[PDB]
Amino acid sequence: MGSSHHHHHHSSGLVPRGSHMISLSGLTSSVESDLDMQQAMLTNKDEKVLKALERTRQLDIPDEKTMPVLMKLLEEAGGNWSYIKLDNYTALVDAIYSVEDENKQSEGS
Numbered sequence: 230m231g232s233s234h235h236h237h238h239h240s241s242g243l244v245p246r247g248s249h250m251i252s253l254s255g256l257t258s259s260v261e262s263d264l265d266m267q268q269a270m271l272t273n274k275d276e277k278v279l280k281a282l283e284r285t286r287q288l289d290i291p292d293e294k295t296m297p298v299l300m301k302l303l304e305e306a307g308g309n310w311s312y313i314k315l316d317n318y319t320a321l322v323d324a325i326y327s328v329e330d331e332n333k334q335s336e337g338s
Contacts, residue, residue, distance in 0.1 A: 259336075272300070277310060284318045286298050289307045 231305060252259060274296065281299040282292050302313045302320045 269296075272296070279320055280310070281321065285321050285325065288322070288325070290321070290329075294325065294328055295321065298328070 255263075261291065272334075278296075278299060281302075282295055283316075285292075285295040285298075298321055301324065303309070304319070306313050
């Protein structure tokens, strides 16, 4: 009136792996960028700025990285698109190519 009926088997538990990091959802942890949004407020855009994104979008470039890129050109050009567009905003090509490249190369923050 006392028999044991159980079984056991070895198992490691192999699971898949993926290298994808993105804040798809909100109201959650990983709020290290949620604050950075404040900086973008002190650096809005303009009507002409939308023109730059035109050439960038062609190469599939996000306005998030292009924002600080285009503003970098007008900085030295004192806000002159005439010259900056002398090569179809070539500056964006070499600029985005640099930033877009090497994204993991860093210590942390």
